[PDB]
Design an enzyme around this catalytic site. Structure first.
Site, short mmCIF file in Angstrom:
data_model
loop_
_atom_site.label_atom_id
_atom_site.label_comp_id
_atom_site.label_asym_id
_atom_site.label_seq_id
_atom_site.Cartn_x
_atom_site.Cartn_y
_atom_site.Cartn_z
N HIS A 1 0.85 -1.17 0.00
CA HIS A 1 0.00 0.00 0.00
C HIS A 1 0.90 1.23 0.00
O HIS A 1 1.94 1.25 0.66
CB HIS A 1 -0.88 -0.05 1.29
CG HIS A 1 -1.57 1.23 1.58
ND1 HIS A 1 -2.40 1.85 0.66
CD2 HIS A 1 -1.64 1.96 2.73
CE1 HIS A 1 -2.87 2.96 1.19
NE2 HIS A 1 -2.43 3.05 2.43
N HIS B 1 0.91 4.53 1.27
CA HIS B 1 0.10 5.13 2.31
C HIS B 1 -0.03 6.64 2.17
O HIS B 1 0.99 7.37 2.24
CB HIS B 1 0.72 4.82 3.69
CG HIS B 1 -0.06 5.38 4.82
ND1 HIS B 1 -0.68 4.60 5.77
CD2 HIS B 1 -0.43 6.66 5.10
CE1 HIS B 1 -1.30 5.37 6.64
NE2 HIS B 1 -1.17 6.62 6.25
N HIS C 1 4.21 0.20 2.56
CA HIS C 1 4.32 -0.98 3.45
C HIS C 1 3.48 -2.13 2.96
O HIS C 1 2.44 -1.91 2.28
CB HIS C 1 3.93 -0.64 4.88
CG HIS C 1 2.52 -0.07 5.06
ND1 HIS C 1 1.40 -0.87 5.25
CD2 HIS C 1 2.09 1.21 5.17
CE1 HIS C 1 0.34 -0.09 5.45
NE2 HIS C 1 0.73 1.18 5.39
N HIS D 1 0.76 -4.61 2.88
CA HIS D 1 -0.62 -4.51 3.43
C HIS D 1 -1.24 -5.92 3.39
O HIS D 1 -2.43 -6.13 3.17
CB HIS D 1 -1.41 -3.43 2.71
CG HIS D 1 -2.45 -2.80 3.60
ND1 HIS D 1 -3.36 -3.58 4.29
CD2 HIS D 1 -2.67 -1.50 3.97
CE1 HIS D 1 -4.10 -2.77 5.04
NE2 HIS D 1 -3.70 -1.51 4.87
N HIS E 1 -5.68 3.88 19.87
CA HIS E 1 -5.64 3.26 18.54
C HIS E 1 -5.58 4.35 17.46
O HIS E 1 -6.52 5.15 17.35
CB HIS E 1 -6.95 2.47 18.33
CG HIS E 1 -7.12 1.38 19.33
ND1 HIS E 1 -6.30 0.28 19.35
CD2 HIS E 1 -7.98 1.26 20.38
CE1 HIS E 1 -6.69 -0.53 20.32
NE2 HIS E 1 -7.70 0.03 20.97
N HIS F 1 -6.90 4.94 10.52
CA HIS F 1 -6.41 5.42 9.27
C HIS F 1 -7.46 5.15 8.22
O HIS F 1 -8.03 4.09 8.17
CB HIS F 1 -5.07 4.69 8.88
CG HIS F 1 -4.68 4.95 7.47
ND1 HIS F 1 -4.58 6.22 6.97
CD2 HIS F 1 -4.38 4.11 6.44
CE1 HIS F 1 -4.28 6.17 5.67
NE2 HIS F 1 -4.15 4.90 5.34
N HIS G 1 -8.14 5.05 4.23
CA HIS G 1 -7.60 5.03 2.88
C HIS G 1 -8.38 5.92 1.94
O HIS G 1 -9.52 6.27 2.22
CB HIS G 1 -7.66 3.59 2.36
CG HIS G 1 -6.63 2.68 2.98
ND1 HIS G 1 -5.72 1.99 2.22
CD2 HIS G 1 -6.40 2.33 4.28
CE1 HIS G 1 -4.96 1.24 3.01
NE2 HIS G 1 -5.34 1.44 4.27
N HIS H 1 -9.19 1.61 9.46
CA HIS H 1 -8.73 0.57 10.42
C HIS H 1 -7.70 1.13 11.36
O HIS H 1 -7.01 2.14 11.08
CB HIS H 1 -8.15 -0.69 9.74
CG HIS H 1 -6.91 -0.42 8.94
ND1 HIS H 1 -5.65 -0.46 9.51
CD2 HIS H 1 -6.72 -0.10 7.62
CE1 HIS H 1 -4.73 -0.22 8.58
NE2 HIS H 1 -5.36 0.06 7.44
N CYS H 2 -7.57 0.45 12.48
CA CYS H 2 -6.48 0.78 13.40
C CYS H 2 -5.16 0.41 12.74
O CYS H 2 -5.04 -0.68 12.19
CB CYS H 2 -6.62 -0.02 14.72
SG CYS H 2 -5.20 0.44 15.74
N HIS H 3 -4.18 1.32 12.78
CA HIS H 3 -2.95 1.11 12.02
C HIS H 3 -1.92 0.41 12.91
O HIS H 3 -0.76 0.28 12.52
CB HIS H 3 -2.36 2.40 11.41
CG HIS H 3 -1.62 2.16 10.10
ND1 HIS H 3 -0.51 1.32 10.01
CD2 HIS H 3 -1.83 2.63 8.84
CE1 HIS H 3 -0.06 1.33 8.76
NE2 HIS H 3 -0.84 2.11 8.02
N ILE H 4 -2.34 -0.04 14.11
CA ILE H 4 -1.47 -0.95 14.86
C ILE H 4 -1.68 -2.28 14.18
O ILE H 4 -2.78 -2.79 14.20
CB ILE H 4 -1.91 -1.00 16.37
CG1 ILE H 4 -1.52 0.28 17.05
CG2 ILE H 4 -1.13 -2.13 17.07
CD1 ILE H 4 -2.11 0.56 18.48
N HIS I 1 -3.40 -5.17 15.60
CA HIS I 1 -4.81 -4.99 15.84
C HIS I 1 -5.63 -5.15 14.57
O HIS I 1 -6.70 -5.76 14.61
CB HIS I 1 -5.10 -3.66 16.42
CG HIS I 1 -4.51 -3.48 17.78
ND1 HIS I 1 -4.54 -2.28 18.42
CD2 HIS I 1 -3.82 -4.34 18.58
CE1 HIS I 1 -3.96 -2.40 19.61
NE2 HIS I 1 -3.52 -3.64 19.74
N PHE J 1 -9.61 -5.27 13.61
CA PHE J 1 -10.04 -3.94 13.97
C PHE J 1 -10.16 -3.05 12.73
O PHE J 1 -9.35 -2.09 12.52
CB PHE J 1 -9.08 -3.34 15.02
CG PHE J 1 -9.72 -2.34 15.93
CD1 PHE J 1 -11.09 -2.12 15.93
CD2 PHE J 1 -8.91 -1.59 16.81
CE1 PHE J 1 -11.67 -1.19 16.81
CE2 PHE J 1 -9.47 -0.67 17.68
CZ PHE J 1 -10.85 -0.45 17.67
CU LIG Z 1 -5.39 -0.57 17.73
CU LIG Z 2 -0.30 2.70 6.13
CU LIG Z 3 -3.28 4.14 3.79
CU LIG Z 4 -4.65 0.14 5.61
#
Ligand SMILES: [Cu+2]
Ligand SMILES: [Cu+2]
Ligand SMILES: [Cu+2]
Ligand SMILES: [Cu+2]
Ligand SMILES: *[C@@H]1O[C@H](CO)[C@@H](O[C@@H]2O[C@H](CO)[C@@H](O)[C@H](O)[C@H]2NC(C)=O)[C@H](O)[C@H]1NC(C)=O
Ligand SMILES: *[C@@H]1O[C@H](CO)[C@@H](O[C@@H]2O[C@H](CO)[C@@H](O)[C@H](O)[C@H]2NC(C)=O)[C@H](O)[C@H]1NC(C)=O
Ligand SMILES: [Cu+2]
Ligand SMILES: [Cu+2]
Ligand SMILES: [Cu+2]
Ligand SMILES: [Cu+2]
Ligand SMILES: [Cu+2]
Ligand SMILES: [Cu+2]
Ligand SMILES: [Cu+2]
Ligand SMILES: [Cu+2]
Ligand SMILES: [Cu+2]
Ligand SMILES: [Cu+2]
Length: 496
Positions: free
Chosen positions: A64, A66, A109, A111, A394, A397, A399, A449-452, A455, A460
């Site tokens: 992805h 980002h 990164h 994905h 959390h 993010h 997209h 989504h949570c970007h951890i 998670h 998540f």
């Molecule tokens: Cu999280």
């Molecule tokens: Cu990202």
């Molecule tokens: Cu993104």
């Molecule tokens: Cu994502």
């Protein structure tokens, strides 16, 4: 850096960014993954060549880009089982998109699952030839990108489901408590010059509180969005966020600790952990001996604003939008839920479900995780923090879009008039009600989504299926994208 037209060959190989050797993911034979650069307006053609043979770290991949809107190229956005099937080992896949009207600091990164934690992640800078902040600095190049990352001695699928980092890497280097002699990153400056540093969090989980002994930092960009300049002396940056800050190398020639304190793992700096070196030209090649002072102007997100002081979409009162959605976080069965549903990757990528005839969000899988959004509408999404979703704060993010943060974490007020816009936001701690707004100008299914990454792996996430009826027409897909799923689905399970 490399790009905007380049091959990116993905492979497995040994690395030791903190003195400890382990197998990780390399990109063009490099760890950490190399910086990709272009200019505003450029077409990027990033030919991702999957040469991995390590099953534990996943032989398939998807990447992805980002922060990029990918308008009309939703098939290129990267998320596995949302925008594509993964590229399969021994195959290549061309991401070909343009970046109209964006410039700033971004990153790329894996994905797929928690693969980026294993090291497929690097910075991207899209320069603006008319950058409105150019007048604040002299230097902005390969050497002013500063990445932060968490690093683990055990691989993402080998350690705990939600691991704790052994090191913080700054530009790919740092120390673990078992490696107090490992090389530190050194960032060079020349006295009298001004630097646009582009701070990029590559982290899979921890946030970092970033500061430089003896210096302040003038923040001028958040997540690719130009801000009004704001002097600060520390920056808490969450997973996947970016900031540009100007540093004026106006102190005495010397070495000064650059500090990146994470919210988990080792939180101190003893023996040079969580640290790097700001070295003025003419300094001795030795470790700083500077002492930290309390941060007295930390960055505060609700104090940030865009360069144009752009208003939030829709009307300046709560719920003054076309569609408002609250996302109630929870946890059950060891998975995160949002409004009662945990995202589980579907066999057919959401985009491919839509191109195959799915006509509304009710028809899309996974059931309960997909939201329909109407076209050309003002959207407000509220993301109330809760201890019911463990591992807060959390960083959520979205997209496909930048959004206005009408309410930030740590703040009780709403700002519709001039709020910061960005693409990753801490949803904070119980009591917070982080709320964002955006306009549906970009047909396609877009992850939220949570970007951890551990998670996300635990569910998540939701998918915003934006303007489903125009998706196929606005996002015509290339033949190689159409071949991804048949190739991937023919694989042995341990190659997937
Ligand atoms: Cu999280
Ligand atoms: Cu990202
Ligand atoms: Cu993104
Ligand atoms: Cu994502
Ligand atoms: C593929 O990658 C994995 C994960 O990096 C490697 O896993 C290691 O396996 C050994 C032996 O089981 C453990 O002692 C290590 O702790 C694991 N390393 C990590 C980083 O988790 C695996 O060895 C790699 N495969 C090959 C053939 O190199
Ligand atoms: C966070 O903010 C959201 C959105 O304002 C709140 O949800 C709204 O609450 C009011 C009062 O219950 C309802 O009339 C609205 O219909 C809700 N809006 C939406 C869009 O669902 C939410 O209650 C706040 N949550 C917390 C925990 O503070
Ligand atoms: Cu094999
Ligand atoms: Cu258009
Ligand atoms: Cu192929
Ligand atoms: Cu998984
Ligand atoms: Cu060395
Ligand atoms: Cu409007
Ligand atoms: Cu309206
Ligand atoms: Cu948008
Ligand atoms: Cu837009
Ligand atoms: Cu195989």
């Amino acid at each position: 850096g490399i790009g905007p037209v380049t091959d990116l060959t993905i492979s497995d190989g040994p690395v030791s960014p903190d003195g400890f050797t382990r197998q990780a993911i390399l990109v063009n034979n490099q760890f950490p993954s190399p910086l990709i650069t272009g200019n505003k307006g450029d077409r990027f053609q990033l030919n991702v060549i999957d040469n991995m043979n390590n099953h534990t770290m996943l032989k398939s991949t998807s990447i992805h880009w980002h922060g990029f809107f990918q308008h009309g190229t939703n098939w290129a956005d990267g998320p596995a089982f949302v925008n594509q099937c993964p590229i399969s080992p021994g195959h290549s896949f061309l991401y070909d998109f343009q970046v109209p009207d964006q410039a700033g600091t971004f990153w790329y990164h894996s994905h797929l699952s928690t693969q980026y934690c294993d090291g497929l992640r690097g910075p991207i800078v899209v320069y603006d030839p008319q950058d409105p902040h150019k007048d604040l600095y002299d230097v902005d190049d390969d050497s002013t990108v500063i990445t932060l990352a968490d690093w683990y001695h055990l691989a993402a699928k080998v350690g705990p489901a939600v691991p704790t980092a052994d090191a913080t890497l700054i530009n790919g280097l740092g120390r673990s408590i078992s490696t107090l002699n490992a090389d530190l990153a050194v960032i060079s400056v020349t006295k009298g010059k001004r630097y646009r540093f582009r701070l990029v969090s590559l982290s899979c989980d921890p946030n970092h509180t970033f500061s430089i002994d003896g210096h302040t930092m003038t923040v001028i960009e958040a997540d690719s969005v130009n801000l009004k300049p704001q002097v600060v002396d520390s920056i808490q940056i969450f997973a996947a966020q970016r900031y540009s800050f100007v540093l004026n190398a106006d102190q005495d020639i010397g070495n000064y600790w650059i500090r990146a304190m994470p919210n988990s793992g080792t939180r101190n700096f003893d023996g040079g952990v969580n640290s790097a070196i700001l070295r003025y030209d003419g300094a001795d090649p030795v470790e700083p001996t500077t002492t930290q002072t309390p941060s007295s102007q930390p960055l505060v997100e609700s104090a940030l604003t865009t360069l144009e002081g752009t208003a939030a979409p829709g009307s300046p009162t709560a719920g003054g939008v076309d569609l408002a959605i609250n996302m109630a976080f929870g946890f059950a069965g060891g998975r995160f839920t949002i409004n009662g549903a945990s995202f589980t990757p579907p066999t057919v990528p959401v985009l491919l479900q839509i191109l195959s005839g799915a006509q509304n969000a009710q028809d899309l899988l996974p059931t309960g995780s997909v939201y329909s959004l109407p076209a050309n509408a003002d959207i407000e999404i509220s993301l109330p923090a809760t201890a019911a979703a463990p591992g807060f704060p959390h960083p959520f993010h979205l997209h496909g879009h930048t959004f206005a943060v009408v309410r930030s974490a740590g703040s009780s007020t709403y700002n519709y008039a001039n709020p910061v816009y960005r693409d990753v936001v801490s949803t904070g701690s119980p009591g917070d009600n982080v709320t964002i707004r955006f306009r549906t100008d970009n047909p396609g299914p877009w992850f939220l989504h949570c970007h951890i990454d551990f998670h996300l792996e635990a569910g998540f996430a939701v998918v915003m299926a934006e303007d489903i009826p125009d998706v196929a027409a606005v996002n015509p897909v290339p033949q190689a994208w159409s071949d991804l799923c048949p190739t991937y689905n023919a694989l042995d399970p341990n190659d997937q």
